[PDB]
């Protein structure tokens, strides 16, 4: 699994609420988190099948 799968989700500076999967590592799943808008990083997906197939396994 890509580094970027480890890192924590990242909401970032602006002001919307767009909810979005991120890959808890300490988890194994993926999970949502509140996103803001803009400046996105690599661990934000915009569903669950994307984040599984990119990140996980078992």
Not at 25 to 54: P, W
């Amino acid at each position: 699994r890509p580094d970027f799968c480890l890192e924590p989700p990242y909401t970032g500076p602006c002001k919307a609420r767009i909810i979005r999967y991120f890959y808890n590592a300490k988890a194994g799943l993926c999970q949502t988190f509140v996103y803001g808008g803009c400046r996105a990083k690599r661990n934000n997906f915009k569903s669950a099948e994307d984040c599984m197939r990119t990140c996980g396994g078992a």
